[PDB]
Amino acid sequence: MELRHLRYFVAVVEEQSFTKAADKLCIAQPPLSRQIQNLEEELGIQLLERGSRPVKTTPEGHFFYQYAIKLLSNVDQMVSMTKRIASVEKTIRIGFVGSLLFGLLPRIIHLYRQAHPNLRIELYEMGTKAQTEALKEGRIDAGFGRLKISDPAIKHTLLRNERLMVAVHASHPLNQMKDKGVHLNDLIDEKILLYPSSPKPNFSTHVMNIFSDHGLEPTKINEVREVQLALGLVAAGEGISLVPASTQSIQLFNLSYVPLLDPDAITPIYIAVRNMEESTYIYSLYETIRQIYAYEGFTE
Amino acid sequence: MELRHLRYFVAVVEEQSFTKAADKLCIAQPPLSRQIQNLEEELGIQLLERGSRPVKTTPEGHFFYQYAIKLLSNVDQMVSMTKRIASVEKTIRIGFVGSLLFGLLPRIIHLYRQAHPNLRIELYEMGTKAQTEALKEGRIDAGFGRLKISDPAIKHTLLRNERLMVAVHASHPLNQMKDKGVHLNDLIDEKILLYPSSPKPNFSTHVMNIFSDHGLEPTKINEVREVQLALGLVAAGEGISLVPASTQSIQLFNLSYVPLLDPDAITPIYIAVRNMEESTYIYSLYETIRQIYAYEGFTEPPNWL
Ligand SMILES: [Cl-]
Ligand SMILES: [Cl-]
């Protein structure tokens, strides 16, 4: 078949008539019907319900239609992307901490891909310290993390203040405050599961920092390997855990998330680049972030 | 006898029923009638003509009733009167951490004082944790500190972000950077003097928080008793220290204060009050803070009114 067949079919489904679609396609109705008849026989499948006056699709017709608008949209994308390629083949390398996979970062990267069709993008999971060294050595070009950096060779900027939340078993008394929220102070005597167990500093450093900023130091603490351990163990009755809000991407039976009322019970997200960085590719990454944030209704 | 006896008797006389009086006093019938009996047997006279409904007094009981209600009334007046002659002098109690003595706090208090000449102002040196408990128990009315509070019964408000500075001996290599400043990262392998040694959390807890916020954990740390010890030992060649910028009120020979380039190398100042605080005395304290800040060229903290 040809793209003509797909375009002819889609117009008929959208206009809901053989003659009405012919007007927008600028052709006569007899040959338009033949093409669709030729498409159906070439497929050996009935796509349109015959013979409806306001034409309706069959089960396979509806399926083929949704596929077709997507395939024809890909052609449009192909053409548009080809005309905006960078002549010199570039690679951009991005470091990130694992917790960022649960929020906006992936769709930011995906959007970034589309802005530079021929750009090779390499993604590396690394902590903040590793990010700092990699940047200075030029092994990454941007790092996304949750900790501030002290280093004259690095420029870090606050992107957003994500809220912290408490993961609890549904039967925990604190789950009564699911819609109201609680204070860090309410958590002082709980069994608290910190994570990950990876090289420090990491997210568990931050959580304990947050308690410490409020004059608090929990003593019933257990460090577990990764987020899923923390949440799985909470779901199994082992205690509670503090998580970034986006970790709600994980929902488990009898696991519940409770908001925190302390204004500074937060986990900031930063972008780190080299101090003297001015690559258009990195400015473009910043704008992609801004684009996504705007769609989400963020400032900040 | 006790006042209880009088209240029980008065109730039976006034209701003319042991049941109606029992339901008025929120007690069972038996104790009511036994207690009156104890009174009657103690005084040696019959006060009530029991057996007859409605319940009425003897001649003796009728007289006793009149003295009893007056006596009970007199007791209530005694208590009310005693509450009246209790001190009319208003006292405001203010908690603060010692490091704030080097900055704007004393002049804020002095100005506050001038605004309220008949007010007793009491000042107590205490840490954020003790402040929090003192506020909840009403032992202070406002607390000034350098740490956030997590307690639903307390409201804390950021007043200003004070810069941290590095205190060094004048011959330290870091002091070659006095004009430009240095980074927290530059201090990681130095001998750092933390203070004070008073109950945690305190200023040393905050300094190490600042480091930890920036992924740093200095290992050459020595806790000393007080700020002057820290600065004195620096001046003596024992290491370096991190101080609030206002601590520059203390100047020692060959002691040099070096700026930090990290934007978040700061030590915030907070006022803490009870969650539902609305006393004009405290609003006035708060306005005094804003007036002093405006005079100093500091950004004013947000409006109360
Ligand atoms: Cl996010
Ligand atoms: Cl000050």
XYZ file of C-alpha atoms and ligand atoms in Angstrom:
607
model
C 0.000 0.000 0.000
C 0.893 3.706 -0.095
C 0.581 6.700 2.264
C -2.283 7.799 0.001
C -4.346 4.829 1.265
C -3.785 5.815 4.910
C -4.556 9.495 4.284
C -7.681 8.586 2.285
C -8.918 6.224 5.017
C -8.277 8.655 7.905
C -10.106 11.536 6.168
C -13.158 9.287 5.619
C -13.177 8.287 9.312
C -12.745 11.905 10.484
C -15.291 13.408 8.039
C -17.534 10.343 8.590
C -18.594 10.299 4.903
C -17.207 9.286 1.485
C -18.281 12.514 -0.275
C -17.431 14.941 2.563
C -13.848 13.612 2.786
C -13.435 14.035 -0.992
C -14.035 17.807 -0.686
C -11.167 18.331 1.781
C -8.919 15.981 -0.237
C -9.780 17.875 -3.464
C -10.758 14.766 -5.480
C -13.937 13.098 -6.806
C -15.792 10.502 -4.693
C -15.743 7.548 -7.165
C -11.920 7.100 -7.240
C -11.719 7.728 -3.467
C -14.005 4.723 -2.861
C -11.881 2.545 -5.172
C -8.660 3.275 -3.242
C -10.280 2.254 0.061
C -11.782 -0.809 -1.655
C -8.269 -1.611 -2.918
C -6.835 -1.102 0.586
C -9.350 -3.496 2.170
C -8.720 -6.220 -0.433
C -4.940 -5.756 -0.156
C -5.363 -6.280 3.598
C -8.126 -8.877 3.141
C -9.936 -7.164 6.024
C -13.140 -5.118 6.228
C -12.294 -1.719 7.758
C -15.495 0.255 7.176
C -18.938 -0.981 8.228
C -20.938 -1.363 4.997
C -23.169 0.220 4.233
C -23.614 2.933 6.861
C -24.729 6.436 5.823
C -22.632 8.081 8.518
C -19.763 5.620 7.972
C -18.602 3.702 11.042
C -15.442 1.638 11.514
C -15.311 -2.084 12.293
C -13.309 -3.283 15.345
C -10.304 -3.735 13.025
C -11.193 -0.430 11.309
C -10.947 1.569 14.546
C -7.662 -0.209 15.337
C -6.228 0.485 11.867
C -7.305 4.143 12.090
C -5.562 4.859 15.424
C -2.454 3.152 14.020
C -2.658 5.190 10.796
C -2.837 8.686 12.358
C 0.184 7.659 14.455
C 2.128 6.331 11.436
C 1.263 9.416 9.347
C 2.318 11.614 12.282
C 5.677 9.782 12.259
C 6.132 10.691 8.579
C 5.453 14.342 9.499
C 8.033 14.004 12.305
C 10.617 12.386 9.986
C 10.352 15.257 7.467
C 10.478 17.950 10.165
C 13.425 16.373 12.009
C 15.505 15.842 8.847
C 15.414 19.578 8.080
C 16.713 20.557 11.548
C 19.714 18.190 11.968
C 23.062 19.453 13.273
C 25.750 18.817 10.619
C 28.465 17.896 13.142
C 27.621 14.662 15.020
C 27.649 15.400 18.744
C 27.445 13.339 21.929
C 26.023 14.740 25.171
C 26.459 12.920 28.448
C 24.182 13.335 31.409
C 24.628 12.137 34.984
C 21.644 11.625 37.276
C 20.704 10.074 40.609
C 18.330 7.118 40.459
C 15.528 8.772 42.434
C 15.007 11.280 39.593
C 13.712 8.472 37.324
C 10.399 8.575 39.205
C 9.617 12.223 38.325
C 10.093 14.675 35.441
C 13.619 13.759 34.296
C 12.772 11.009 31.784
C 10.169 13.037 29.877
C 12.666 15.931 29.854
C 15.291 13.710 28.239
C 12.736 12.329 25.826
C 11.674 15.852 24.831
C 15.373 16.832 24.557
C 15.957 13.928 22.113
C 13.308 15.310 19.748
C 14.839 18.808 19.782
C 18.149 17.380 18.521
C 17.221 14.372 16.335
C 20.797 13.294 15.514
C 22.280 13.982 18.963
C 23.729 10.958 20.741
C 22.615 11.165 24.377
C 24.363 9.014 26.979
C 22.875 8.622 30.447
C 24.872 7.628 33.518
C 23.570 6.912 36.981
C 25.921 8.609 39.440
C 25.898 10.350 42.793
C 26.631 14.025 43.308
C 30.321 13.612 44.145
C 30.885 11.371 41.088
C 28.946 13.967 39.010
C 31.232 16.751 40.233
C 34.403 14.904 39.229
C 32.924 13.688 35.918
C 31.922 17.277 35.000
C 35.368 18.680 35.824
C 36.943 15.901 33.763
C 34.418 16.394 30.940
C 32.992 12.862 31.253
C 29.483 14.277 31.632
C 28.169 17.678 30.487
C 25.285 18.028 32.918
C 24.465 16.375 36.236
C 21.089 16.108 37.947
C 21.110 15.499 41.713
C 19.712 16.264 45.167
C 22.721 17.762 46.982
C 24.504 21.123 46.857
C 28.068 21.361 45.578
C 31.005 23.331 46.933
C 33.507 23.738 44.092
C 34.586 26.838 42.086
C 34.714 24.778 38.843
C 31.041 23.851 39.078
C 27.837 25.858 38.621
C 24.805 24.290 40.316
C 21.281 25.734 40.179
C 18.089 24.922 42.058
C 15.418 23.624 39.691
C 12.632 22.714 42.138
C 11.863 22.007 45.803
C 10.190 18.602 45.726
C 8.217 17.679 48.867
C 9.202 14.817 51.142
C 6.537 12.349 52.223
C 6.278 9.496 54.733
C 5.667 5.984 53.446
C 3.646 3.951 55.971
C 1.641 0.738 56.148
C -2.081 1.503 55.683
C -2.763 0.299 59.266
C -0.290 2.758 60.854
C -1.935 5.421 63.094
C -0.248 8.168 60.980
C -2.311 6.991 58.000
C -5.297 8.797 59.602
C -3.487 12.000 58.589
C -3.151 10.913 54.945
C -5.175 13.913 53.724
C -4.030 16.394 56.403
C -0.297 15.710 56.735
C 2.090 15.367 59.677
C 5.267 16.896 61.101
C 8.832 15.504 61.162
C 8.576 15.572 64.997
C 5.784 12.963 64.773
C 8.314 10.520 63.274
C 11.104 10.757 65.866
C 10.270 7.477 67.690
C 9.382 5.416 64.590
C 11.463 2.671 62.959
C 12.713 4.610 59.942
C 14.084 2.929 56.820
C 16.788 4.966 55.069
C 18.102 4.249 51.569
C 20.047 3.726 49.433
C 23.095 1.847 50.783
C 25.271 3.251 47.972
C 28.369 5.444 48.605
C 27.684 8.498 50.759
C 26.523 11.196 50.471
C 23.166 10.166 49.022
C 19.419 10.419 49.695
C 19.775 8.973 53.223
C 22.308 11.693 54.040
C 19.712 14.214 52.945
C 16.837 12.741 55.000
C 18.975 12.755 58.152
C 20.153 16.277 57.254
C 16.499 17.363 57.066
C 15.784 15.959 60.532
C 18.999 17.597 61.768
C 18.003 21.011 60.297
C 14.943 20.788 62.593
C 16.970 19.796 65.670
C 15.977 16.132 65.358
C 17.953 12.888 65.277
C 15.973 9.612 64.924
C 17.708 6.656 66.607
C 15.591 3.768 65.297
C 17.107 3.867 61.836
C 17.930 1.096 59.404
C 19.670 1.539 56.092
C 18.368 -0.667 53.287
C 19.767 -1.159 49.784
C 17.329 0.695 47.463
C 13.937 2.472 47.387
C 11.981 -0.712 46.561
C 13.420 -2.438 49.630
C 12.363 0.542 51.747
C 8.795 0.508 50.365
C 8.478 -3.294 50.241
C 9.595 -3.563 53.855
C 7.182 -0.808 54.922
C 4.383 -2.715 53.129
C 5.454 -5.855 54.988
C 5.267 -4.213 58.441
C 8.917 -3.249 59.116
C 8.473 0.479 59.752
C 8.173 3.760 57.863
C 10.289 5.594 55.276
C 10.773 9.132 53.962
C 10.605 9.491 50.174
C 10.514 12.252 47.561
C 6.919 12.995 46.463
C 7.578 11.527 42.957
C 8.295 8.110 44.505
C 4.482 7.828 44.551
C 5.040 6.458 41.045
C 5.357 3.262 43.107
C 2.063 2.083 44.545
C 1.917 -1.102 46.615
C -0.907 -2.892 48.407
C -1.447 -1.430 51.895
C 1.322 1.115 51.318
C 0.245 4.697 51.878
C 1.979 8.065 51.520
C 1.464 10.846 54.064
C 2.417 14.466 53.376
C 4.739 16.477 55.641
C 3.636 19.851 56.946
C 7.079 21.338 57.710
C 7.735 23.926 54.977
C 11.353 22.756 54.696
C 10.639 19.003 54.668
C 11.815 19.081 51.068
C 14.261 17.407 48.725
C 15.590 19.971 46.175
C 16.617 19.051 42.619
C 19.699 20.717 41.071
C 21.383 20.811 37.691
C 25.178 20.910 37.807
C 27.334 22.041 34.897
C 30.897 23.315 34.530
C 31.307 26.902 35.749
C 32.178 28.335 32.305
C 29.704 26.188 30.351
C 28.057 27.891 27.376
C 27.237 25.121 24.888
C 23.990 25.638 22.951
C 23.236 21.932 23.675
C 23.174 22.659 27.401
C 21.166 25.882 27.076
C 18.738 23.804 25.014
C 18.568 21.259 27.893
C 17.756 24.103 30.302
C 14.963 25.300 27.969
C 13.560 21.775 27.692
C 13.382 21.668 31.504
C 11.633 25.057 31.473
C 9.232 23.787 28.793
C 8.243 20.732 30.849
C 7.943 22.788 34.048
C 5.662 25.241 32.222
C 3.338 22.401 31.089
C 3.292 21.182 34.712
C 2.516 24.675 36.031
C 5.808 25.045 37.925
C 8.127 27.990 38.638
C 10.223 26.518 40.436
C -16.363 19.133 108.724
C -15.592 19.958 105.081
C -17.092 22.291 102.454
C -18.327 19.134 100.685
C -20.679 18.553 103.646
C -22.084 22.073 103.335
C -22.562 21.786 99.550
C -24.353 18.435 99.948
C -26.695 19.793 102.663
C -27.454 23.039 100.816
C -28.347 21.017 97.703
C -30.830 18.778 99.592
C -32.423 21.833 101.294
C -32.747 23.733 97.985
C -34.031 20.804 95.886
C -36.147 19.482 98.795
C -35.197 15.995 97.580
C -32.229 13.650 97.979
C -32.754 12.389 94.403
C -32.996 15.829 92.740
C -29.924 17.034 94.679
C -28.043 13.823 93.786
C -28.722 14.471 90.080
C -27.616 18.098 90.558
C -24.327 17.147 92.266
C -23.661 14.288 89.790
C -23.457 11.725 92.619
C -25.369 8.632 93.792
C -28.110 8.966 96.452
C -26.374 6.869 99.178
C -23.097 8.870 99.590
C -25.129 12.096 99.592
C -27.267 10.904 102.515
C -24.327 9.370 104.427
C -22.242 12.566 104.167
C -25.122 14.666 105.522
C -25.495 12.077 108.301
C -21.775 12.441 109.135
C -22.291 16.230 109.291
C -25.394 15.817 111.488
C -23.633 13.346 113.809
C -20.539 15.584 113.907
C -22.509 18.730 114.829
C -24.764 16.712 117.136
C -27.967 18.276 115.786
C -30.702 17.149 113.397
C -30.523 19.456 110.366
C -33.073 17.732 108.153
C -36.587 16.492 108.791
C -35.936 13.231 106.913
C -38.908 10.962 106.182
C -41.196 13.799 105.116
C -41.505 14.578 101.394
C -40.631 17.196 100.271
C -37.490 17.325 102.437
C -37.429 20.310 104.801
C -35.138 21.483 107.605
C -35.477 21.554 111.378
C -35.414 25.022 113.020
C -31.687 24.400 113.665
C -31.151 23.230 110.062
C -32.899 26.306 108.662
C -30.503 28.577 110.560
C -27.550 26.358 109.633
C -28.551 26.530 105.936
C -28.418 30.334 105.945
C -24.941 30.412 107.483
C -23.761 27.609 105.165
C -24.677 29.362 101.884
C -23.055 32.563 103.149
C -19.936 30.619 104.196
C -19.736 28.954 100.764
C -20.316 32.323 99.079
C -17.605 33.833 101.321
C -15.132 31.133 100.232
C -15.731 31.896 96.522
C -15.177 35.598 97.274
C -11.985 34.764 99.234
C -10.576 32.948 96.168
C -11.663 35.723 93.772
C -10.149 38.394 96.056
C -6.853 36.500 96.434
C -6.630 36.279 92.623
C -7.074 40.078 92.495
C -4.193 41.049 94.831
C -1.826 38.800 92.835
C 0.849 40.751 90.916
C -0.569 43.059 88.228
C 2.913 43.540 86.715
C 3.168 42.088 83.213
C 6.279 40.052 82.471
C 7.579 39.144 79.023
C 10.092 36.331 78.942
C 12.506 35.991 76.045
C 14.730 33.015 75.242
C 17.822 33.398 73.049
C 20.958 31.537 71.984
C 24.209 33.259 73.022
C 25.560 33.869 69.501
C 22.823 36.456 68.945
C 24.356 38.740 71.604
C 26.938 39.857 69.017
C 24.312 41.050 66.530
C 21.078 43.039 66.588
C 19.270 41.343 69.487
C 20.470 43.580 72.324
C 19.511 46.810 70.516
C 16.139 45.257 69.590
C 15.555 44.507 73.284
C 16.761 47.975 74.276
C 14.335 49.596 71.835
C 11.551 47.207 72.901
C 12.277 48.175 76.514
C 11.990 51.898 75.682
C 8.557 51.283 74.099
C 7.310 49.489 77.239
C 8.721 51.226 80.359
C 6.330 49.535 82.833
C 6.995 46.073 81.416
C 9.185 43.552 83.210
C 11.399 41.963 80.565
C 13.163 38.747 81.474
C 15.892 37.344 79.267
C 17.037 33.717 79.353
C 19.957 32.159 77.526
C 18.717 28.823 76.165
C 19.024 26.569 73.138
C 16.361 25.873 70.521
C 15.258 22.601 72.225
C 14.807 24.231 75.669
C 13.077 27.211 73.992
C 10.574 24.891 72.318
C 9.640 23.265 75.659
C 9.606 26.642 77.464
C 7.249 28.134 74.862
C 4.832 25.185 75.108
C 4.855 25.450 78.905
C 4.579 29.263 78.789
C 7.886 29.818 80.596
C 9.007 32.107 77.744
C 6.932 34.029 75.199
C 9.399 34.396 72.334
C 12.556 32.519 71.382
C 15.472 33.536 69.165
C 17.585 30.817 67.601
C 19.532 29.402 64.682
C 17.608 26.193 64.069
C 14.277 25.238 62.539
C 11.606 23.730 64.746
C 9.335 20.838 63.976
C 6.492 21.025 66.482
C 2.834 21.737 65.610
C 2.512 23.850 68.783
C 5.336 26.222 67.720
C 5.476 28.752 64.890
C 8.935 29.739 63.682
C 9.719 32.611 61.331
C 12.870 33.316 59.345
C 14.158 36.780 60.224
C 17.356 36.981 58.143
C 20.021 34.815 56.516
C 23.310 35.673 58.212
C 26.491 34.790 56.304
C 28.946 32.305 57.739
C 32.589 33.382 57.815
C 35.831 31.466 58.369
C 37.915 32.584 61.343
C 41.613 32.041 60.645
C 44.984 33.119 61.982
C 46.332 35.945 59.760
C 49.177 33.708 58.509
C 46.915 30.886 57.281
C 47.065 30.274 53.498
C 43.259 30.777 53.400
C 43.849 34.385 54.486
C 45.600 35.046 51.175
C 42.016 34.826 49.901
C 40.563 37.356 52.364
C 39.396 39.732 49.589
C 37.854 37.115 47.276
C 36.715 34.546 49.853
C 36.954 30.738 49.897
C 34.701 27.675 49.515
C 33.478 25.182 52.129
C 35.387 22.596 50.076
C 38.681 24.374 50.905
C 38.167 23.760 54.648
C 37.556 20.012 54.522
C 41.018 18.910 55.684
C 41.578 21.737 58.189
C 41.447 21.447 61.972
C 37.979 22.875 62.679
C 36.923 24.230 66.060
C 33.222 23.722 66.695
C 31.294 25.343 69.557
C 29.560 25.608 71.937
C 29.697 22.472 74.116
C 26.224 23.147 75.574
C 23.250 20.767 74.995
C 22.669 19.725 71.373
C 21.371 20.715 68.910
C 23.289 23.997 68.822
C 25.585 26.050 66.552
C 28.050 23.181 66.025
C 25.128 21.040 64.853
C 24.341 23.763 62.292
C 27.915 24.145 60.998
C 28.127 20.401 60.357
C 24.656 20.579 58.737
C 25.986 23.229 56.312
C 28.925 20.966 55.425
C 26.671 17.901 55.074
C 24.242 19.881 52.856
C 27.178 20.375 50.462
C 28.160 16.680 50.519
C 31.011 17.358 52.958
C 32.060 15.787 56.266
C 35.190 17.336 57.872
C 36.869 14.779 60.158
C 39.364 17.019 62.024
C 36.773 18.483 64.383
C 37.246 19.650 67.969
C 34.339 20.741 70.138
C 35.290 23.671 72.393
C 33.214 25.232 75.196
C 32.348 28.673 73.814
C 32.981 31.062 70.904
C 35.808 33.029 72.597
C 37.623 29.727 73.189
C 37.223 28.867 69.505
C 38.455 32.306 68.377
C 41.170 32.425 71.040
C 42.538 29.038 69.975
C 42.418 30.082 66.339
C 44.371 33.234 67.321
C 46.773 30.900 69.151
C 47.374 28.716 66.062
C 45.111 25.731 66.904
C 42.968 25.616 63.746
C 40.068 27.417 62.079
C 36.434 28.062 62.982
C 33.147 28.866 61.288
C 31.286 31.760 62.865
C 28.201 33.896 62.113
C 29.238 37.184 60.492
C 28.040 39.180 63.556
C 30.692 37.388 65.633
C 32.993 39.929 63.953
C 32.057 42.031 66.991
C 35.024 40.156 68.496
C 38.339 41.287 67.032
C 41.575 39.675 68.188
C 45.174 40.297 67.164
C 46.030 38.263 64.062
C 42.491 36.873 63.884
C 41.109 37.212 60.399
C 37.560 36.614 59.177
C 37.311 35.191 55.669
C 34.068 35.285 53.585
C 32.575 32.097 52.139
C 31.746 32.039 48.419
C 29.094 29.308 48.722
C 25.729 31.066 48.360
C 24.237 28.712 50.975
C 27.039 29.204 53.549
C 24.576 30.863 55.894
C 23.246 30.779 59.428
C 19.559 31.847 59.509
C 18.072 33.662 62.511
C 14.531 32.659 63.567
C 11.954 33.916 66.035
C 9.802 31.183 67.581
C 6.470 31.704 69.317
C 3.526 29.546 70.354
C 1.472 28.496 67.338
C -1.594 30.554 68.273
C 0.232 33.570 69.764
C -1.542 36.897 69.351
C -0.263 39.025 72.249
C 0.327 42.682 71.354
C 3.512 42.446 73.447
C 4.912 39.938 70.937
C 3.649 41.787 67.846
C 5.339 44.863 69.326
C 8.561 42.855 69.781
C 8.217 41.737 66.171
C 7.707 45.318 64.943
C 10.764 46.377 66.940
C 12.750 43.742 65.009
C 11.467 45.201 61.707
C 12.240 48.772 62.755
C 15.824 47.873 63.730
C 16.272 45.920 60.459
C 15.010 48.850 58.392
C 17.422 51.143 60.285
C 20.322 48.731 59.635
C 19.533 48.409 55.928
C 18.388 44.798 56.308
C 15.362 43.427 54.476
C 12.341 43.462 56.805
C 10.756 40.135 57.837
C 7.142 39.647 56.591
C 4.143 41.505 58.042
C 2.221 40.299 61.079
C -0.588 42.846 60.628
Cl 10.616 15.771 39.392
Cl 21.841 39.997 63.885
